[PDB]
Amino acid sequence: MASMERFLSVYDEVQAFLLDQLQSKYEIDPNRARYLRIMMDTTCLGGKYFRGMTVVNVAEGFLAVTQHDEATKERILHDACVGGWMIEFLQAHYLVEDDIMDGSVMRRGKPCWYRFPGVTTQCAINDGIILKSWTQIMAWHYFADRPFLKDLLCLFQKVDYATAVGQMYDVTSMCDSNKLDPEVAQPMTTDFAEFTPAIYKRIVKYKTTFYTYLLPLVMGLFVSEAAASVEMNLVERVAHLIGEYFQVQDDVMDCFTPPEQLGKVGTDIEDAKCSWLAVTFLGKANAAQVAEFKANYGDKDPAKVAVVKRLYSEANLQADFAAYEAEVVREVESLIEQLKVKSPTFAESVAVVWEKTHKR
Amino acid sequence: MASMERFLSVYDEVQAFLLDQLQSKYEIDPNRARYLRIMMDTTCLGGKYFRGMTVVNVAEGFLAVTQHDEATKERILHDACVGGWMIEFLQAHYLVEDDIMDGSVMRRGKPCWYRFPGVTTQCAINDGIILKSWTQIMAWHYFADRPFLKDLLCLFQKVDYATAVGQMYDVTSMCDSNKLDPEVAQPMTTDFAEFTPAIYKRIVKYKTTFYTYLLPLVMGLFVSEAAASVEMNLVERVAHLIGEYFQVQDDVMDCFTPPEQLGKVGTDIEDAKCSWLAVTFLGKANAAQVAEFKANYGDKDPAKVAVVKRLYSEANLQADFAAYEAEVVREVESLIEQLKVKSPTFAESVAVVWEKTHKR
């Protein structure tokens, strides 16, 4: 893919620009520049670039139906790559800080960044702050004169806040709301009353859907000067729908995918997370199954984790998943049909985003 | 002071706006809203508001010499308070994350936020991210239609990146540059070769001067639509000069101020920090004093920390300080004289900022 190859060559360019700027305006020395280059590569590279490439694909979709000089086609594609890298770097930030907050061990088959011997939490928290700063430095440099700059920066910032709010909802999901209090150590829920579909939907919506689907799609529109060409209410509803399904998939894999291909251990059970698997289990369990779940969930002991996994296999949650999948397919196709009214090209870009999500 | 009282009443307004927005657009529930309100109060309130009030003072200085309708005077003062709160919240962010990175215990006589029982590192890292997000949410809401918005956001972001870069320089200052490597646990310097005045000046410049002096002063100018009224090169040189002296003062107090009025223990010695005291000690020490410093610096043992403090008392570093102070006074008065050429009002605001710094 030449799309991919354009994306990646823009990474080398953006990294040279940020490092050269540190030398030339921030008095950095070469060994610290080298540590930051390594940091950038280790935290930003290695994934699928799904989010970044979504900006590129959305841009390419408009480029095929819009008259432009060559030099304009190139600038828009450049802008789409840079925008995509903003989003990858924002994600990198989230992952460095999250792995620290959660005491995670591995990420994509390597140690989490804060566990590199010469890093440590002391430097890794800061490194994660710098990752997000770089998304701004990028925007101001590459987009200084762009008519979309204000709207892109404003959306970026809203998406970032929504994600941070989401992470809060996530990490406090195993506590009873009425017991949240900075003055009192948070005890795990015993009733699991807040393990419902609506609550789960709130966590996922804020925690991942803004930055994983909304941001890439709208960004593709901005760089293409095409926002006024779509119904924004639909982009939102489709981004939140496809974003939820995406997270449901990760939740199932956390439990059932082998660590080898997960790249991680998977500790949602021990961590007592409000996962789709738990919420769906409690939505179908009989009384005795609920009691057994409660005696076993949220505990590091591998025998108790096997009891939960066994309850999930026996509740047949692969059927509730095929059913949730079938409903999402229906609603996604419906939203794409609505998006054809004002833009058949954007609609088709959304179909490709969905198709790439549905396969995994 | 009515200045103070305006500043603080703007805090209540901004906090109500951010919490009401979380309820109305982010589906927050009351107990999480209450945790965020507490977080905001504990991390943002309690200090001197030196940085925030600097924006207010700079605005008030222009207001006394510029013709405006009353409603415009109020909006500018409102804008100056909001801008000041942005800076206080940015600082709050830095302090939450820093106390975590450094394993700090106390801050202004209370436990560091991540040590509150119901917080934990898991939530505190995120809380610190949210603190900084709020500075953006503020800017976009209160300043949406302001002609200074782009320039304020661009400067904010540059100052933030410079601070993060500075923190990196700070926390790696005890290592030999040529040994920095994410793959290798960082050993403490033995030669202390990088403990020089120029290196020290680099750390302080980025670590604190941008956000503590440059940002507040330039922000006061933006909200007042007065940037074109000053020589920006001088504001920079004065902000960096006064900012350094400010940090030298904290470095001396870390060592010699009683914990009671410091609000902290003070562990620069144990932490092997490139402090002004160390750098100045090595700039005057004889060979035997240098050897003794080396056998004792950077170690948690209270007997070795007393040996360093004793070497500092015996090297008579209160004289190098009076001398550094006398030189800063000279250069600060010189820069204020230069600033009178294009703005006597701004110059006088800089004199007050300096006078408030010099006393402490």
UniProtKB/TrEMBL annotation, chains A, B:
Protein known as: Farnesyl diphosphate synthase
Binding sites annotated in the UniProt record for Zn(2+) 4: D102, D170
Entry binding sites for Mn(2+) 3: D250
Binding-site residues for Zn(2+) 6, renumbered to this chain: D250
Binding site residues for Zn(2+) 3: D102
Family of the protein in this entry: Belongs to the FPP/GGPP synthase family.
Binding site for Zn(2+) 8: D250, D254, D268
Amino-acid positions noted as binding Zn(2+) 1 in the UniProt annotation, renumbered to this chain: D98, D102
Positions with a binding annotation for Zn(2+) 5: E236
Binding residue positions for Zn(2+) 7: D250, D254
Binding site residues for Mg(2+) 2: D102
Binding site for Zn(2+) 9: D250, D268
Binding site for Mn(2+) 4: D250, D254
Single Gene Ontology BP annotation: farnesyl diphosphate biosynthetic process
MF terms (GO), sorted A to Z: (2E,6E)-farnesyl diphosphate synthase activity; dimethylallyltranstransferase activity; metal ion binding
Binding site for Mg(2+) 1: D98, D102, D170
Binding-site positions, Mg(2+) 4: D250, D254
Binding site for Mn(2+) 2: D102, D170
Organism: Trypanosoma cruzi
